[PDB]
A paper describes a structure:
All six mATG8s are essential for autophagy, are conjugated to autophagosomes and serve to recruit two broad classes of molecules: autophagy receptors and autophagy adaptors. On the other hand, autophagy adaptor proteins interact with mATG8 proteins on the convex autophagosomal membrane surface and can regulate autophagosome formation (ULK1/2 16), autophagosome transport (FYCO1 17), crosstalk with the endocytic network (TBC1D5 18) and autophagosome fusion with the lysosome (PLEKHM1 19), but are themselves not degraded by autophagy. Structural studies have shown that the side chains of the aromatic residue (Θ) within the core LIR motif are placed deep inside of a hydrophobic pocket (HP1) on the Atg8/LC3/GABARAP surface, formed between α‐helix 2 and β‐strand 2, while side chains of the hydrophobic LIR residues (Γ) occupies a second hydrophobic pocket (HP2) between β‐strand 2 and α‐helix 3 (reviewed in 3, 23, 24). To provide a molecular basis for the specificity of the PLEKHM1‐LIR interaction with the mATG8 proteins, we solved the crystal structures of PLEKHM1‐LIR in complex with the LC3A, LC3C, GABARAP and GABARAP‐L1 proteins.
To obtain the complex structures, we created chimeric proteins consisting of the mATG8 C‐terminally fused to the LIR sequence with a Gly/Ser linker. Crystals diffracted to 2.50 Å for PLEKHM1629–638‐LC3A2–121, 2.00 Å for PLEKHM1629–638‐GABARAP2–117 and 2.90 Å for PLEKHM1629–638‐GABARAP‐L12–117. W635 interacts with E17 in GABARAP and GABARAP‐L1 with distances of 3.5 Å and 4.3 Å. Additionally, aromatic carbons of W635 are significantly closer to the carbons of GABARAP non‐polar residues, forming the HP1. Our structural analysis revealed that PLEKHM1‐LIR residues in positions of X1 and X2 also participate in the binding and could be important for the subfamily‐specific interaction's network (and EV4 and results in Appendix). Residue N637 at the X2 position formed more preferential contacts for binding of the GABARAP proteins due to better geometry of an intermolecular hydrogen bond to an invariant arginine residue in all GABARAP proteins that is lysine in all LC3 proteins. In comparison, R28 in the GABARAP subfamily proteins is always hydrogen‐bonded to N637 with a generally shorter bond distance and the geometry of the hydrogen bond between the arginine and asparagine is close to optimal for a hydrogen bond (N‐H…..O angles are as follows: LC3A 16.6°, LC3B 48.3°, LC3C 26.7°; GABARAP 4.7°, GABARAP‐L1 6.9°). Additionally, in the GABARAP subfamily structures, this hydrogen bond is stabilized by coordinated cation–π interaction of R28 guanidinium moiety and corresponding Y25 aromatic side chain. V51 GABARAPs’ side chains are in close proximity to the PLEKHM1 V638 (3.8 and 4.3 Å for GABARAP and GABARAP‐L1, respectively), while side chains of residues in equivalent positions of LC3 subfamily proteins are further away (LC3A/B/C V54/V54/V60 – 4.2/4.6/4.6 Å).
Residue numbers in the entry: 1 to 122
Write the structure that this text describes.
Amino acid sequence: DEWVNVGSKFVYKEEHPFEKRRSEGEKIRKKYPDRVPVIVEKAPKARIGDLDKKKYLVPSDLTVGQFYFLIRKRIHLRAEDALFFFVNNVIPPTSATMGQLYQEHHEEDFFLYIAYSDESVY
């Protein structure tokens, strides 16, 4: 708005060229206007478990707090340990919805990229 968002390197972005990512992201957003296409990767330096899958298609009214719980169970992070999301190297508010987060932070390929970590700074 009206900025193009550029974030850190993701292995997804390295392995799928921009033109293919943008074609797919434009299609999924047209097909599902109220679902958010999210790429989730572990930050390189994080000392917690990896995810099986990295592509999530979620509700735009899902809260970030709800998405935290989802990722946490999927990496089997013990409840006592902290988990943090970074989008464009910023920690989003836990009260935001995935829809608001997408609107603010999506990249030019129409995807939203989230790195997760056990550290609260990066």
